[PDB]
Design a protein around this ligand. Structure first.
Ligand SMILES: Nc1ncnc2c1ncn2[C@@H]1O[C@H](COP(=O)(O)OP(=O)(O)O)[C@@H](O)[C@H]1O
Ligand SMILES: O=P(O)(O)OC[C@H]1O[C@](O)(CO)[C@@H](O)[C@@H]1O
Length: 424
C-alpha cells in the first residue's frame, strides 16, 4: 500500500535543521515536509519557535537569546526536550517516518543532544545547515517573514529589524558550523550555501537522503507564477467517457482561444508552456501562438481496461472493482492501468522541473492536475483524488511566505462537469 519512496525508507529519520536566524530554516522545513508527504513518506515538522512562543507567550527582545541568560537558556532547552519527546511519539506511536526538527541547533552540544536522542531510539540523523552571510539577503528575509511574525507586535520594521539583527548577533557568539574536515567528518549532512548557489554534502546514507539532497539542490526562491489548467473540453468529456485520445469540442476550442487572450492580457514574462502528448492538450496549446513542450509523462491517468468507458458502463461491467475504487480512490489501480499513487510517482519529474523553472503554464488533465495541485497546496491522499479541477478554469499559484497562494480564474466559456463525488 505504501508508495515507492516509502518502501525505500527503513529506520525512521530525523532531519535536523541548523543555522542562524533568518536563514530559511522554517521555509525549507515546511517545503521539504510537503514534498516528502506528497511522494508518500509520512513526515512532520517540529518548529521549536512554536514550542518556545507557547512556553513564553511574550514579546521578548534579543535579551532572551543571549547565551549567558541562564533562565532563558533553561527554558529554551526544556522546549527542545519536549519537542524531542513529541518527535519520539510521532516516529514510534503514530507511524511517522520522518521528523523535521526545525531549530537553530547551532552548537555542537545541542547537536550531540539530538544525536544521543536518535541513538537511544535507533533513528537515523541527517542535518540540513543553511549558511548565508550576504546582508542584503538577510535583510530581505527579515522584512519578508520576521517583521510581521508572532515574535513581534505592531511596530515599524525599522525597530523590529534592529532587534532581530541583535538576536542574530547573540547566536553568532556560540555558532559552530558543521566542519566536515574534523568534528563532523562522520555525520550525514548538506550545507545549503548562499541560498542554493553552493552545497557541501557529506556521507549520504540511503535512498531517502539521496532524494532529499536532490530536491534541496533544485529548488530556488525566485518569485514566479505557476498556472495549471486542463485541456479545453473534449469530445469524450461531453459523452462522459474516461481516458482516450479525443479532440477538443468546438467549445473546448473556444476555451483555447479565451486562454490565448488571457495570456495576451497578462503578458507573463518568459512563460513556458507544457502539455501532454494527448491531442486535447496539444490542440489547446496550438491556439495560443506560443512555443510549447509536450511531455509524455503529463498524459492522463491510465484507466487500463476501463479506457474510453463511462462510469455507468464501468459499474455495470465491473461492479466490485467500481465499488473498490470508491472505497480506496488513491490506492486503487485500474487493471492494466494506474492508481493515483502511481500517477504521483510518474509526475515527480514534472514537480522537480517546476521547482527548477520560473513562470510555467501546465495544460494537462483532471487526475494529473489533482496530483499537481495537491503538491503545491499540501493536500493529503484522502483529498487528492477529489480535488475540484473544472474545465475552463485556470489555477494561478503564487509562492507566498512559507506556502503557496491559489487563485481560480474561470474563463467565460461553459463546459460539462466531469467531477464525480464519492457516493453518499
Ligand atoms: N537557503 C536559504 N538561505 C537563505 N534564505 C532562504 C533560504 N531558503 C529560503 N530562504 C529565505 O528565508 C526566508 C524565511 O526565513 P525563515 O525560514 O523563517 O528563517 P529561519 O527559520 O532560519 O529563521 C524567506 O524570505 C526565504 O526566501
Ligand atoms: O479519477 P477520476 O475522478 O475518475 O478522474 C479521472 C478521469 O477524469 C478524466 O480526465 C475526465 O473524465 C478522465 O480522462 C479520467 O479517467
Amino acid at each position: 500500500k505504501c508508495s515507492w519512496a516509502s518502501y525505500m525508507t527503513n529506520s525512521p529519520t530525523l532531519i535536523v535543521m541548523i543555522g542562524l536566524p533568518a536563514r530559511g530554516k522554517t521555509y525549507v522545513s515546511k517545503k521539504l515536509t510537503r514534498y516528502l508527504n506528497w511522494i508518500g513518506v509520512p513526515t512532520k515538522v517540529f518548529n521549536l519557535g512554536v514550542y518556545r512562543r507557547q512556553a513564553v507567550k511574550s514579546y521578548k527582545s534579543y535579551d532572551f537569546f543571549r547565551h549567558d541568560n541562564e533562565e532563558a537558556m533553561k527554558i529554551r532547552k526544556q522546549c527542545a526536550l519536549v519537542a524531542l519527546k513529541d518527535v519520539k511519539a510521532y516516529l514510534t506511536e503514530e507511524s511517522g517516518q520522518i521528523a523535521v526538527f526545525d531549530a537553530t541547533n547551532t552548537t555542537r552540544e545541542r547537536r550531540d543532544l539530538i544525536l544521543n536522542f536518535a541513538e537511544e531510539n535507533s533513528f537515523k540523523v541527517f542535518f540540513v545547515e543553511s549558511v548565508c552571510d550576504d546582508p542584503d539577503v538577510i535583510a530581505a528575509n527579515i522584512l519578508e517573514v520576521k517583521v510581521s511574525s508572532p515574535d513581534y507586535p505592531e511596530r515599524n520594521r525599522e525597530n523590529v529589524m534592529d532587534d532581530f539583527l541583535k538576536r542574530i548577533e547573540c547566536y553568532k557568539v556560540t555558532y559552530q558550523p558543521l566542519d566536515p574536515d574534523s568534528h563532523d567528518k562522520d555525520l550525514s549532512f548538506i550545507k545549503v550555501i548562499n541560498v542554493g548557489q553552493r552545497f557541501l554534502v557529506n556521507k549520504v546514507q540511503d535512498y531517502i537522503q539521496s532524494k532529499i539532497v536532490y530536491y534541496l539542490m533544485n529548488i530556488h526562491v525566485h518569485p514566479r507564477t505557476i498556472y495549471l489548467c486542463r485541456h479545453g473540453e473534449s469530445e469524450f468529456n461531453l459523452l462522459g467517457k474516461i481516458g482516450g485520445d479525443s479532440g477538443l469540442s468546438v467549445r473546448g476550442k473556444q476555451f483555447a482561444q479565451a486562454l490565448r487572450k488571457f495570456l495576451e492580457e497578462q503578458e507573463i514574462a518568459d512563460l513556458k508552456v507544457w502539455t501532454s502528448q494527448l491531442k486535447r492538450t496539444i490542440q489547446t496549446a496550438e491556439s495560443l501562438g506560443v512555443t510549447y513542450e509536450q511531455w509524455k509523462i503529463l498524459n492522463e491517468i491510465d484507466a487500463g481496461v476501463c479506457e474510453e468507458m463511462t462510469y455507468a458502463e464501468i459499474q455495470e461491467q465491473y461492479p466490485d472493482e467500481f465499488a473498490l475504487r470508491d472505497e480506496e480512490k488513491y490506492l486503487y489501480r485500474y487493471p492494466g492501468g494506474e492508481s493515483y499513487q502511481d500517477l504521483v510517482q510518474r509526475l515527480e519529474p514534472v514537480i522537480m522541473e517546476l521547482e527548477r523553472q520560473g513562470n510555467v503554464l501546465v495544460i494537462s488533465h483532471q487526475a494529473v492536475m489533482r496530483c499537481l495541485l495537491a503538491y503545491f497546496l499540501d493536500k493529503g491522499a484522502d483529498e487528492l483524488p477529489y480535488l475540484r479541477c473544472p474545465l475552463h478554469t485556470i489555477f494561478k499559484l503564487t509562492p507566498v511566505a512559507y506556502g503557496c497562494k491559489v487563485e481560480t480564474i474561470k474563463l467565460n466559456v461553459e463546459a460539462v462537469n466531469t467531477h464525480r463525488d464519492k457516493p453518499t
